[PDB]
Structure 1
Amino acid sequence: QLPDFIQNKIDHYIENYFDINKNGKHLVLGKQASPDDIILQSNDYLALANHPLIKARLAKSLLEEQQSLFMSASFLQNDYDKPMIEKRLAKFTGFDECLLSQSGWNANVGLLQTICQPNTNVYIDFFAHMSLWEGARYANAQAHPFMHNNCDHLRMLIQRHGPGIIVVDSIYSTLGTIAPLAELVNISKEFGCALLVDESHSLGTHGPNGAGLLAELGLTREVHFMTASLAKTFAYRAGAIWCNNEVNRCVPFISYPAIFSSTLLPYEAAGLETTLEIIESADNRRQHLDRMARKLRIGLSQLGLTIRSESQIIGLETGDERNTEKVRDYLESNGVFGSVFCRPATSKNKNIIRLSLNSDVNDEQIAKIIEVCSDAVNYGDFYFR
């Protein structure tokens, strides 16, 4: 057992976050899924996790003679030490330079540490990813949250607070909405602002050969920074920073997680190249996903639910905790497993049960989700928003 100043916090937490739930667990933890159940919890959009060629390429490079490169990524910043995958990924998205990181989180935290000073203006969408808020808070930037995809509010804020960095998800993790990138590019140009787009949820699923949403819209050359977790479509535990400028020569010596935390091992980079080749040609998978996503969005919204989504991420709005619990349990009972997003990913009264669709989902399964929600809507134990 523990001294009071920690224990008090730990008792309170357990009481207000575990004990209050019908199952005694934290709200995200439901029951165990069957193999027959529809699992919509994974960020692996193109269902690549178990792809034979990717597995083969990693195992192969894993079995080669690994040189003992257990140290920071900064010690490996010479051209000969810099992996082929960065050059290819840069080429892929159309950005100048690409830098590998240990995760999407670290890419965001790192980039924001490099370009920010205390009280730097950071104009960040209300619903942008936590990695981005925390990036900015670590750097002691001045956060100026703006209302979701609301360009008028952003205009007011910049005009009020001066030039800064405008930070957005291209596709938002909780809601599946799409940022207004064309208008956001105009705005940054107009006010002398830097623009940072986190493409974690569009990279691979969107754009030509899956090069992303900036690449789809034709905006690549008009943006300063893009970051992305490689743990979504790229199905790998890593991240990347892209620059249309020379910031990537500096990140490795300034970012604390790049300086003080160990780099990706050489065999990990070769795993990604194969993945890239597979993503690059997965037009069918990209298109199937897009079809199913829409079919699900249409069917759910017509039942009266707010489906803000315009993508493969679909957020059922379930309100308060007690309600969310009731919705989770009902869905799971009927073989539908989404992921509870509660605090601090959300406000405590605007919970989301997120459905991450992937290219392996079929029409029959889409039909089932709709029907389950349609039955929900008349069972009488809960509400949607």
Structure 2
Amino acid sequence: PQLPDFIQNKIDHYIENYFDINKNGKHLVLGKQASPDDIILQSNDYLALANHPLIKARLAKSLLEMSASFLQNDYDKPMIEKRLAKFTGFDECLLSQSGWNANVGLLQTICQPNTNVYIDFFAHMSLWEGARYANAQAHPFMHNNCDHLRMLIQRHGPGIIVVDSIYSTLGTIAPLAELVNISKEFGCALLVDESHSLGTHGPNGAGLLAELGLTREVHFMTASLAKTFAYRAGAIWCNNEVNRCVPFISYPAIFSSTLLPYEAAGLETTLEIIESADNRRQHLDRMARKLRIGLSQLGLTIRSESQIIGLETGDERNTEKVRDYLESNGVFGSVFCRPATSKNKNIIRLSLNSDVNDEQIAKIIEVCSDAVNYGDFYFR
């Protein structure tokens, strides 16, 4: 059944302006195929746990042998939640199907149809849509800009301040200490997404709030477990009662099925293995810094302060050229383009993980050095 025009028209225009314009007839995010020799910097599995023998074993053993609301009794709630909460220092933790759902769910629970939400420009898209589904009043503030933040709160009233601890496209770090002060001052709740800091930062990997000593000041913490925990799930920690209600309020929690008990048993192993990876955290940290210093001396804006490094490659055409160069030279990042970015501010993201060599770090810098000189594109 051929499509009606109202759909077909849209689909053609999309196909035209998003696939056809690229030199390979594909979406900008899709490039070449990588070799076993090439350097891949795409995964969010920062501590390189995706193959971990123990973790796999725990899962197989547990799988050998509906909705989440009907499982909110004391006897129905998994040990993994008590361990994560303890781990993080927060009072309660609630499992979700994903980081995305965790954000969406928390926000729908705690928000009302005009609630002030003060969200960093670069906060994960799920926080945005979170506030949007709840029909909250979104108040964007310039990246990590507390002055802008103050203005807007002063202007619009108390509400919920929303940030990534470590930003997904840029590797920047939120001014958590100052944001904690700001929410105290203006009687606001603070929601922090530690997707990119949890496991990689803090004491035993417990995260940045843990590292900065700010856990006790923060109302809410969320995270995807599809980064360091290398698992398709989410979690919401509360220093309050909200978690008793989220399972009955959040749509994703109500009308969408939950993880099974073996999935939750697999996380417990991951947690242990994470707590002890002081080795991998330190090495990764070393590597990120090495890479960060090396790209900066080249002239590239490198805002990152973490294991996520953003090569700012301007507009789509330029971004394609940059990507092709990087890939032809054995370096594979991930293109971030609209709607994650704006059309004219794409990023090629380099995700570092604990498996990366000093040798591989020197190659990335080198390849970028030569890129800088080549002259087929520019960097911002």
**If the TM-score is normalised by the length of the shorter chain, which range does it land in?**
over 0.9
User: 2: distance between equivalents of 1:124 and 1:378?
Assistant: 38
Q: What is the Cα deviation at residue 130 of structure 1?
A: 0.1
Tell me how many residue pairs correspond in the alignment: 378
Q: What is the Cα deviation at residue 326 of structure 1?
A: 0.1
Deviations along 1:249-308, one digit per CA (max 9) or x if unpaired, are 000000000000000011000000000000000000000000000000000000000000
* 3-state SS of paired residue (1:23): coil
* 3-state SS of paired residue (1:124): strand
* 3-state SS of paired residue (2:44): coil
Q: What is the Cα deviation at residue 243 of structure 1?
A: 0.1
1:142 is matched with which residue: 137, 146, 151? Answer: 137
User: 2: distance between equivalents of 1:239 and 1:37?
Assistant: 31
Q: What is the Cα deviation at residue 50 of structure 1?
A: 0.2
Q: Percent identity?
A: 100
Alignment match, 1:133: 128
Q: What is the Cα deviation at residue 36 of structure 1?
A: 0.6
In structure 1, the gaps of 5 or more residues are 64-70
Q: What is the Cα deviation at residue 221 of structure 1?
A: 0.3
Alignment match, 1:60: 61
Deviations along 1:145-174, one digit per CA (max 9) or x if unpaired, are 000000000000000000000000000000
1:336 is matched with which residue: 327, 331, 336? Answer: 331
Alignment match, 2:83: 88
Alignment match, 2:32: 31
Q: What is the Cα deviation at residue 219 of structure 1?
A: 0.2
Q: What is the Cα deviation at residue 34 of structure 1?
A: 0.2
Q: What is the Cα deviation at residue 62 of structure 1?
A: 0.6
User: 2: distance between equivalents of 1:329 and 1:295?
Assistant: 24
Normalised TM-score (structure 1): 0.98
Deviations along 1:210-250, one digit per CA (max 9) or x if unpaired, are 00000000000000000000000000000000000000000
User: 2: distance between equivalents of 1:378 and 1:36?
Assistant: 24
Alignment match, 1:119: 114
Q: What is the Cα deviation at residue 86 of structure 1?
A: 0.1
Moved over 3 A (4+): none
Deviations along 1:54-73, one digit per CA (max 9) or x if unpaired, are 0000000010xxxxxxx111
User: 2: distance between equivalents of 1:88 and 1:79?
Assistant: 15
Q: What is the Cα deviation at residue 364 of structure 1?
A: 0.2
User: 2: distance between equivalents of 1:365 and 1:49?
Assistant: 20
Deviations along 1:336-381, one digit per CA (max 9) or x if unpaired, are 0000000000010000000000000010000000000000011110
Q: What is the Cα deviation at residue 193 of structure 1?
A: 0.2
Q: What is the Cα deviation at residue 117 of structure 1?
A: 0.4
User: 1: distance between equivalents of 2:133 and 2:165?
Assistant: 23
Q: What is the Cα deviation at residue 20 of structure 1?
A: 0.2
User: 1: distance between equivalents of 2:356 and 2:195?
Assistant: 20
Deviations along 1:13-72, one digit per CA (max 9) or x if unpaired, are 000000000000000000100011000000000000000000000000010xxxxxxx11
* 3-state SS of paired residue (2:149): helix
1:179 is matched with which residue: 162, 174, 177? Answer: 174
User: 2: distance between equivalents of 1:83 and 1:318?
Assistant: 45
Alignment match, 1:283: 278
User: 1: distance between equivalents of 2:346 and 2:356?
Assistant: 25
* 3-state SS of paired residue (2:75): helix
Alignment match, 2:52: 51
User: 2: distance between equivalents of 1:111 and 1:72?
Assistant: 17
Q: What is the Cα deviation at residue 116 of structure 1?
A: 0.3
* 3-state SS of paired residue (2:252): helix
Q: What is the Cα deviation at residue 97 of structure 1?
A: 0.1
User: 1: distance between equivalents of 2:89 and 2:112?
Assistant: 28
Map 1:289-308 → 2, pairs under 5 A: 289-308=284-303
User: 2: distance between equivalents of 1:183 and 1:3?
Assistant: 53
Alignment match, 1:349: 344
User: 2: distance between equivalents of 1:249 and 1:36?
Assistant: 49
Q: What is the Cα deviation at residue 335 of structure 1?
A: 0.2
User: 2: distance between equivalents of 1:143 and 1:379?
Assistant: 43
Q: What is the Cα deviation at residue 113 of structure 1?
A: 0.2
Alignment match, 1:66: none
Q: What is the Cα deviation at residue 190 of structure 1?
A: 0.3
User: 2: distance between equivalents of 1:232 and 1:79?
Assistant: 28
Deviations along 1:314-348, one digit per CA (max 9) or x if unpaired, are 00000000000000000000000000000000010
User: 2: distance between equivalents of 1:266 and 1:182?
Assistant: 37
Q: What is the Cα deviation at residue 194 of structure 1?
A: 0.4
Q: What is the Cα deviation at residue 131 of structure 1?
A: 0.5
* 3-state SS of paired residue (1:81): coil
Alignment match, 1:97: 92
* 3-state SS of paired residue (1:378): helix
Q: What is the Cα deviation at residue 201 of structure 1?
A: 0.1
In structure 2, the gaps of 5 or more residues are none
User: 2: distance between equivalents of 1:378 and 1:363?
Assistant: 23
Q: What is the Cα deviation at residue 3 of structure 1?
A: 0.2
Alignment match, 2:42: 41
* 3-state SS of paired residue (2:295): helix
Alignment match, 2:226: 231
